[PDB]
Design an enzyme around this catalytic site. Structure first.
Site, PDB file in Angstrom:
ATOM      1  N   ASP A 105      23.971  41.625  56.736  1.00  0.00           N
ATOM      2  CA  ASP A 105      23.266  41.751  58.176  1.00  0.00           C
ATOM      3  C   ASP A 105      22.334  42.555  58.014  1.00  0.00           C
ATOM      4  O   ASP A 105      22.342  43.507  57.004  1.00  0.00           O
ATOM      5  CB  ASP A 105      24.502  42.321  59.199  1.00  0.00           C
ATOM      6  CG  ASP A 105      23.739  42.365  60.561  1.00  0.00           C
ATOM      7  OD1 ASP A 105      22.641  42.138  60.675  1.00  0.00           O
ATOM      8  OD2 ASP A 105      24.688  42.705  61.452  1.00  0.00           O
ATOM      9  N   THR A 109      18.128  40.837  63.175  1.00  0.00           N
ATOM     10  CA  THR A 109      18.083  42.160  62.642  1.00  0.00           C
ATOM     11  C   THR A 109      18.065  41.974  61.167  1.00  0.00           C
ATOM     12  O   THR A 109      17.486  42.588  60.534  1.00  0.00           O
ATOM     13  CB  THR A 109      19.375  42.905  62.912  1.00  0.00           C
ATOM     14  OG1 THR A 109      20.527  42.226  62.371  1.00  0.00           O
ATOM     15  CG2 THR A 109      19.843  42.807  64.394  1.00  0.00           C
ATOM     16  N   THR A 110      18.793  41.018  60.624  1.00  0.00           N
ATOM     17  CA  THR A 110      18.748  40.677  59.149  1.00  0.00           C
ATOM     18  C   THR A 110      17.359  39.970  59.272  1.00  0.00           C
ATOM     19  O   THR A 110      16.554  39.929  58.078  1.00  0.00           O
ATOM     20  CB  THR A 110      19.815  39.659  58.785  1.00  0.00           C
ATOM     21  OG1 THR A 110      19.374  39.288  57.522  1.00  0.00           O
ATOM     22  CG2 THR A 110      19.527  38.416  59.630  1.00  0.00           C
ATOM     23  N   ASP A 162      29.524  39.546  65.501  1.00  0.00           N
ATOM     24  CA  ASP A 162      28.110  39.506  65.596  1.00  0.00           C
ATOM     25  C   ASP A 162      27.602  38.305  66.371  1.00  0.00           C
ATOM     26  O   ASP A 162      27.061  38.330  67.280  1.00  0.00           O
ATOM     27  CB  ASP A 162      27.414  39.191  63.845  1.00  0.00           C
ATOM     28  CG  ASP A 162      27.734  40.301  63.218  1.00  0.00           C
ATOM     29  OD1 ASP A 162      27.609  41.522  64.160  1.00  0.00           O
ATOM     30  OD2 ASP A 162      27.460  40.411  62.074  1.00  0.00           O
TER      31      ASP A 162
END
Lengths: 514, 510, 102, 509
Positions: A48, A81-82, A382
């Site tokens: 992540d 986000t990654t 997530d």
């Protein structure tokens, strides 16, 4: 020291680059998980964007700054986000040239703005209002899951993910607050994952066969023990003086059977029939004879329960936490539609399931309990955010950066400024967009080049959102693919990437402070 | 990295090199450690004590590397060893071998997923075709041969020649008492190693074999209520005063006698609770002994936890220091609880016989610990390979007559299934040759020489390598019938297992 | 053990009457004030030992210069017996305890 | 022991190296300095006061540089960044020349003569404001809170401050100071919205009052500020041994209790329902006010009581016998302890004191208040600068290039050596518009010359370059403005250290 003007940003640009390379596959099913030794000295695996940051102990201020700012978005989405690290420094890689060409980083920060707005405008114009169908939820769930774990792992887990949220929207909750309870469980393989509409306690107390199989569960969560102590001195009362100890020896064993037979009463008070298994649940221990005196009556008493369960049980069953037992009706002790103490390995994990208004759905994962099983503990929560985001926004688009091009196309195709000054920024701005979908393809397969001139001409042909096939490297319709960008998800990176780049792009003096 | 931040030691080259290379390091000996193994490995464990074996897991756990690459895959090798007693000697080599095709494909420039996924579906294809190569099934635990036939294969996969007397001695330990249907137990059948006698004097006494000196009399009853205690004697004599014995001349008088009546009450309270055997990890005392002789409660002078543990494990006993009157909670279990001399060593013997729960206790008489513990090692991993908990183990060629079939199966099919995955699918059928090489390693010839002939044996399931020269010149020994097959399952895992970590450890550039 | 407080007793013993003297010290300076202001008005006996004796003025005076020798002598001597006993007491504490424990 | 040209250059090197990014920090367009720490703490700030503390000070002049920035930060707090800007400049530009051309003083003397020229030029280009019109102020205050770049909440903080500052506006030295800030007293309240926050007559005391302090609601009845001379007398008119023992309790309390009676019965005549005891507060004193049938209030800060001397607007008296409404607690008074959020808050209203309202601030949280709170603290500094100086002067290059030509012409009309300092000073001005052009992203020497053309004709009356838009602009039309005072002051301060560091030729121990 001082890294002056161009030097200070030359530090900023660099620290972004090498990390972005890590995340070119941290992202998508193509995304490669990354492991951490020196982040702790533990053996640690994670996929992540923000968490890997925090996991590592990151000395470089840029990364140190980033872990905080990507958080706010990683708070919301968890995927993208990654993604997010790419566009930011890449935009630095854009603009630094322009200031290396010579220009003010001012006007380019300036220049990004109207481009950000047209994007924000485009973000509206692009975002596709979609429905709450669990299917529609599956593909948003699994695309984040696919990003974070294997598509298989995405698939097999996706169901329970998109399931609980339906019962948490049964609450009409716009987000996911309860039913967030995840449970890792002793197993040879992380293959096993179960969806418990109710909760799961991990304990049967210490006594088996209490009528631990419970169809009608009137839930007594009692943080007070039936085990105060079997010896002379009380649970919290300690005495090294002799005469004070002979005082407590007589009624210590009694005040147990006080609370014990309160339940024995409470059983018949609740039930009157051993038929309905009455579930006592203790945050602390419970005496064996207490259990014995209870178990024989058919009372299933649980001890050493967890405070979150106590919270969960109180809420999920319409349950109650109690500091006393006495006597109460079945409903005064909240009801679980089903309760079964389930032994796997040694520990008997009580399945308290479909509690009345099962406000908390325990998602149980049976695995090796390695960081591998922790490695799948993320994508779910997530993805939970993602579907929660998808729950949040009816407006969700194709993923795989189909928006990027359609952004980068229109945003650049027209001058939103009809200026240099902003368009200069706008130029750099919408350019850093395409980093993701092309490199994904480029990491997947076909180079940035073809896929872009594919997807661009394709979007130019389409206006349909066509986006990379991450297992091919050339675009598809990611609406059809299932990889789906929540407007809640996709919007915030536009906030972050810009707003972070704003002030960090403007520094000249830098020094040790203090 | 370039920036002072970014904690990691793994990545990029050092991934596509060092990780896989560090993975290469340990599989090196696992080659010498699987199948017939003439090779041997000195190991000092932080006793500085040498020990010799062919098994990796015993060694690898000790070994400490910077990189989780080694640190991870052992878990899968354990995950095998957990589920299957042997093949773990193999389970490491294939992955490490199959890995280094990637770094080659990385020099050939094949993507992570591209290299990974070819192995994957081929692994499924394997897992599809792997049971197709089931060449037998096991049958009867009560039969010694039906068991011992297999058992050699794993003992073989540890040590070659010994397997014969051993595998028989194993089912003679009655692997058969348990059905091997949903159940089987080591601690019940537990190996108990008597140093002395012969190594082939290693015997079978069903029911506990405790090399510990068997004291008191024989148990008060053979059903014995068994109160096992960690240190029920801390001494009832106190160590105090001046000499670390006495200070005042008046001191000694109370030191000596106090041990007696306390132990008298203690050993009376052993009879008062009704324990028919007393087990002292604490010291033995002749009075208490004579009390245990009076109260006739069999005495155990000293305990490893393994004693207490198993006694806690098996009997349902609970070992606790008692300066305290003993109280039976431990109670009894074993219906016949004996003194015996096995190896003519005083042997504390508890026995109870049940289709499940029976102790049939492997007693190794042996001339050398350093051997008898490695002799233990193979029988351990042999009976743990006996542990499948399928009485019919859906046997496949043992010692790997399989790979030649599959090395033929996949990469042929590997091209049929097209696209660059096919090469990973075709690389998939390559590292099969490891044990054909790893035996030809300890056999001394070329795997090419091996595989060329063992491709020339074509569809066989039988002919393959081994020890001696018949793994050398022909590379042909019948690894269906030397008497040697292996279960599909232990085989099935290694592929499945070594699929995972190998795939995994590549994915991680941090 | 016995050797601990044997010494601290006679420590505490001669400690207090010594301190009693400190009250008497002020008095022994005040008795130099009281008798010196006695010209033979009130009959001055020494109170020195149990015999109470018809006395004279110099016998009254020279006595209290000698009665200060109480506060002089008894106070001083003990500061010996203080540490004279204290050290042998402190000495014997760790020795015999560690034994009986060891 | 360091001295002379090297120091004189080192003074610049010390002073000037600061302002570099600090001038880019000037204006809403700003380039934050990154301050990493040896710890590693990263700091992005455009504000020198933070930047000044955090940085290693390489030179005692930097230590001196801190002083006058803290000075203005203490003086106003507005334009603190700007005070160190032109101090280095004066030094930076001319110094080496004219000390190589040999003099501290000719520049030192040319500091003042350049100074008043601006002040003189200012009062022409500084044009009066309507304080009668709060918005004629507010627009600047709005221009000031957009200088603080919060127009969201602080546009209300504008009004609240403004309305307060117009009310906290008063003072008399006989020269009659316009504002008084030490009168202005805000509150810090969780609960309520800052839009519901307001200002009421007198000093609202939340400072000692977060809870019961003076009853709750004392409507007319007085609060009694006590500067007496109330200390309960151990004897009657004499102080005797303190009370260690029963007799001392009996005998002395006999003499003690009647004196507080002699005292706080002189209190009961002024009609308090509450008496806040700052001096003479002691176990007996407040005990007798409940016996004097008045609430007593214990061990309180006189800062409040002085604020309270501005709240009910009374004085405080040490008179033991004479204690009255006019002496303490003037006006009818309104003493109201209200719970706004969870905290009970004394509001002293019915102010008898000129104008004088003080600030209710209740935010839904402390924090939502704080964003108002700081800019309201900024707006009051702004408002008073409009109040102290009621001439609004156009911000930036308009006020900048204007004075320069005067100074040059001045220097040219003087045509001495001091011309060069003025030539330095007039050019020292041009940095900030250049910096704004530096900041905006345009080419300055063009816009400079362009701004010269704005002066060559217009005299740059309302025309500077506007760093936000980076263009020659009408600051009147833009509404870009500021009080002469802080303009003067911050500038007049920027003169001072350049006078200093040029005066100081010896750094020793």
């Amino acid at each position: 020291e001082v890294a002056r003007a161009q030097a200070a940003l030359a530090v900023n640009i660099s620290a972004a680059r090498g990390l972005q390379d890590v995340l070119r596959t941290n992202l998508g099913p193509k995304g490669t998980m990354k492991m951490l030794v020196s982040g702790a000295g533990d053996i640690k695996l994670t996929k992540d964007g923000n968490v890997l940051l925090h996991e590592m102990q990151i000395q470089h201020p840029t990364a140190s700054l980033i872990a905080k700012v990507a958080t706010a978005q990683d708070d919301i989405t968890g995927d993208g986000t990654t993604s997010n690290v790419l566009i930011i420094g890449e935009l630095l890689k854009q603009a630094d040239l322009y200031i290396s060409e010579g220009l003010h980083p001012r006007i380019i920060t300036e220049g990004f703005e109207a481009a950000k707005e047209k994007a924000l405008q485009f973000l509206e114009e692009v975002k596709v209002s979609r429905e709450m169908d669990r299917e529609t939820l599956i593909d948003v769930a699994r695309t984040s899951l696919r990003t974070k774990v294997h598509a298989e792992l995405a698939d097999v887990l996706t169901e329970a993910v998109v399931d609980s949220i339906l019962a948490i929207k049964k609450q009409d909750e716009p987000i996911d607050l309860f039913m967030i309870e995840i449970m890792e469980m002793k197993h040879k393989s992380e293959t096993d994952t179960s969806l418990i509409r109710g909760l799961v306690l991990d304990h049967g107390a210490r006594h088996p066969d209490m009528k631990k199989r419970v169809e009608d569960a009137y839930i007594l969560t009692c943080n007070v023990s039936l085990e105060y102590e079997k010896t002379e001195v009380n649970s919290g009362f300690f005495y090294k003086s002799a005469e004070e100890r002979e005082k407590l020896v007589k009624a210590e064993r009694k005040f147990i059977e006080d609370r014990v037979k309160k339940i024995i009463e409470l059983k018949r008070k609740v039930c009157g029939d051993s038929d309905k298994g009455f579930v006592v649940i203790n945050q602390k221990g419970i005496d064996p004879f207490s259990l014995d005196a209870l178990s024989k009556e058919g009372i299933v008493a649980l001890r050493r329960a967890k405070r979150r369960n106590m919270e969960r049980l109180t809420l999920a069953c319409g349950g109650v936490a109690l500091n006393s037992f006495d006597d109460l009706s079945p409903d005064c002790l909240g009801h679980a539609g089903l309760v079964y103490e389930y032994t796997l390995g040694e520990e008997k994990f009580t399945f308290i399931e479909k509690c009345n208004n099962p406000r908390s759905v325990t998602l149980l994962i049976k695995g090796p309990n390695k960081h591998t099983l922790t490695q799948i503990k993320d994508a779910v929560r997530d993805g939970l955010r993602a579907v929660k985001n998808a729950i949040d926004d009816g407006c969700v688009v194709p993923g795989a950066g189909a928006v990027e091009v359609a952004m980068a196309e229109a945003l650049i195709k027209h001058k939103p400024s009809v200026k240099g000054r902003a368009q200069l920024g706008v130029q750099a701005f919408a350019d850093a967009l395409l980093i993701i979908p092309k490199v994904l393809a480029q990491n997947s397969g076909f180079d940035l080049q073809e896929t872009l001139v594919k997807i661009q001409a394709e979007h130019s042909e389409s206006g349909q959102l066509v986006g990379v096939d991450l297992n091919t490297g050339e675009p598809m319709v990611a609406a059809e693919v299932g990889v789906w960008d929540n407007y809640c998800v996709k919007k915030q990176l536009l906030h972050s990437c810009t707003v972070i780049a704003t002030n960090i792009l403007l520094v000249d003096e830098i020094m040790r402070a203090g | 990295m370039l920036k002072e931040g970014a904690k990691h030691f793994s990545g990029l080259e050092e991934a596509v090199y060092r990780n896989i290379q560090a993975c290469k390091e340990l599989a090196q000996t696992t080659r010498t450690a699987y199948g017939p193994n003439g090779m041997n490995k000195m190991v000092i464990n932080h006793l500085e004590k040498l020990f010799v074996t062919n098994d990796a897991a015993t060694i690898l756990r000790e070994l400490e590397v910077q990189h989780p690459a080694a640190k991870m895959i052992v878990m899968a090798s354990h995950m095998q060893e957990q589920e299957v007693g042997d093949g773990t000697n193999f389970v490491l080599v294939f992955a490490g071998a199959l890995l280094e095709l990637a770094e080659e494909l990385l020099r050939i420039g094949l993507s992570v997923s591209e290299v990974i996924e070819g192995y994957e579906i081929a692994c499924r294809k394997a897992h599809e075709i792997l049971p197709n190569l089931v060449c037998c099934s096991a049958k009867n635990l009560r039969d010694i041969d039906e068991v011992s036939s297999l058992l050699r294969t794993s003992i073989m996969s540890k040590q070659y020649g010994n397997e014969v007397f051993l595998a028989k001695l194993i089912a003679q330990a009655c692997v058969s008492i348990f059905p091997d249907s949903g159940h089987f137990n080591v601690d019940n059948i537990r190996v108990c190693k008597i140093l002395g006698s012969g190594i082939s004097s290693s015997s079978v006494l069903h029911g506990m074999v405790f090399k510990k000196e068997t004291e008191g009399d024989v148990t008060s009853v053979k059903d014995a209520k068994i109160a096992v205690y960690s240190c029920p004697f801390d001494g009832m004599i106190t160590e105090t005063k001046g000499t670390v014995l006495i200070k005042t001349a008046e001191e000694l008088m109370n030191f000596s006698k106090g041990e007696e009546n306390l132990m008298d009450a203690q050993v009376k309270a052993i009879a008062d609770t009704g324990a028919n055997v007393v087990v002292t990890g604490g010291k033995v005392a002749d009075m208490a002994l004579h009390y245990a002789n009076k109260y006739n409660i069999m005495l155990v002078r000293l305990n490893s936890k393994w004693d207490l543990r198993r006694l806690c494990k098996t009997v349902g006993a609970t070992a606790l220091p008692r300066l305290t009157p003993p109280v039976l909670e431990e109670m009894g279990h074993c219906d016949s609880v004996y003194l015996s001399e096995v190896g003519d060593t005083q042997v504390v013997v508890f026995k109870h016989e049940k289709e499940d729960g029976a102790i049939s206790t492997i007693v190794l008489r042996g001339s050398t610990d350093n051997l008898m513990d490695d002799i233990e090692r193979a029988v351990d991993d042999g009976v743990n390979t006996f542990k499948v908990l399928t009485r019919d183990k859906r046997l496949v060629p043992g010692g790997g007559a399989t790979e030649i079939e599959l090395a033929k199966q996949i990469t042929s099919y590997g091209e049929t299934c097209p696209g660059l995955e096919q090469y990973a699918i075709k690389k998939f059928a390559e590292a099969f040759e490891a044990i054909p090489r790893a035996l030809a390693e300890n056999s001394g010839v070329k795997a090419n020489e091996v595989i060329s002939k063992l491709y020339a044996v074509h569809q066989e399931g039988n002919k393959n390598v081994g020890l001696d020269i018949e793994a050398e010149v022909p590379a042909v020994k019948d690894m269906l019938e030397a008497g040697i097959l292996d279960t599909y399952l232990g085989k099935y895992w290694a592929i499945k297992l070594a699929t995972n970590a190998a795939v995994t450890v590549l994915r991680v550039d941090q | 053990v016995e050797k601990y407080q044997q010494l601290q007793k006679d420590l505490s013993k001669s400690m207090s009457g010594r301190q009693k003297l400190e009250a008497q010290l002020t008095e022994n300076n005040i008795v130099k004030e009281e008798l010196a202001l006695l010209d033979g008005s009130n009959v001055v006996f020494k109170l020195l030992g149990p015999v109470l004796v018809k006395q004279e003025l110099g016998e009254a005076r020279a006595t209290v210069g000698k009665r200060l020798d109480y506060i002089t002598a008894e106070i001083k001597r003990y500061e010996s017996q203080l540490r004279d006993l204290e050290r042998q007491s402190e000495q014997q504490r760790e020795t015999l305890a560690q034994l009986q424990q060891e | 022991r360091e001295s002379g040209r090297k120091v004189q250059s080192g003074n610049i090197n010390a002073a000037k190296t600061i302002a570099d990014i600090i001038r880019t920090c000037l204006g809403p367009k700003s380039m934050m300095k990154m301050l990493l720490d040896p710890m590693g703490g990263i700091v992005m700030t455009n504000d020198g006061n933070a930047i000044l503390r955090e940085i290693q000070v390489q030179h005692p002049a930097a230590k001196s540089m801190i002083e006058i920035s803290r000075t203005q930060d203490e003086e106003v707090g507005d334009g603190t960044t700007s005070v160190i800007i032109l101090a280095g400049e004066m030094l930076s530009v001319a110094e080496h020349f004219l000390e190589q051309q040999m003099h501290p003083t000719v520049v030192i003397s040319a500091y003042r003569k350049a100074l008043d020229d601006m002040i003189s030029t200012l009062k022409k280009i500084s044009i009066p404001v309507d304080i009668s019109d709060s918005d004629m102020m507010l627009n600047i205050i709005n221009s000031s809170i957009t200088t603080k770049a919060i127009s969201r909440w602080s546009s209300l903080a504008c009004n609240i401050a403004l309305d307060a500052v117009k009310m906290v506006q008063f003072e008399e030295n006989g020269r009659k100071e316009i504002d008084i800030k030490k009168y202005a007293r805000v509150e810090k309240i969780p609960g309520g919205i800052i839009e519901d926050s307001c200002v009421l007559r007198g000093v609202m005391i939340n400072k000692d009052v977060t809870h019961p302090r003076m009853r709750r609601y004392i409507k007319n009845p007085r609060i009694v500020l006590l500067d007496s001379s109330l200390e309960y007398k151990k004897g009657e008119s004499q102080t005797d041994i303190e009370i260690t023992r029963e007799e001392d309790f009996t005998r002395i309390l006999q003499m003690e209790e009647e004196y507080i009676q002699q005292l706080c019965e002189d209190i009961i005549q002024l009609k308090p329902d509450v008496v806040i005891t700052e001096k003479g507060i002691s176990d007996l004193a407040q005990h007798y006010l409940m016996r004097a049938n008045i609430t007593a209030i214990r061990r309180v800060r006189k800062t409040d009581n002085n604020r309270i001397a501005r709240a009910c607007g009374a004085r405080i008296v040490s008179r033991p016998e004479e204690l009255r409404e006019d002496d303490v607690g003037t006006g009818a008074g309104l003493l109201e302890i209200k719970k706004i959020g969870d905290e009970y808050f004394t509001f002293i209203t019915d102010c008898k004191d000129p104008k004088a309202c003080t600030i209710l601030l209740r935010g839904a949280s402390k924090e939502i208040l704080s964003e108002v709170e700081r800019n309201l603290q900024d707006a009051m500094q702004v408002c008073r600068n409009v109040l102290l100086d009621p001439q609004l002067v156009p911000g930036g290059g308009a006020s900048e290039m204007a004075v320069a030509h005067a100074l040059t012409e001045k220097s040219k009309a003087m045509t001495g050596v001091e011309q060069w300092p003025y030539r330095a000073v007039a050019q020292a001005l041009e940095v900030i518009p250049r910096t704004l052009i530096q900041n905006c992203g345009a080419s300055t020497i063009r816009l400079l010359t362009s701004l010269r053309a704005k002066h060559t004709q217009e005299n740059c009356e309302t025309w500077g370059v506007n760093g936000e838009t980076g263009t020659l602009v009408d600051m009147k039309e833009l509404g870009i403005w500021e009080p002469l005072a802080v303009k003067l002051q911050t500038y007049k301060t920027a003169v001072e250290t350049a006078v200093l560091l040029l005066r100081i030729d010896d750094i020793v121990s």
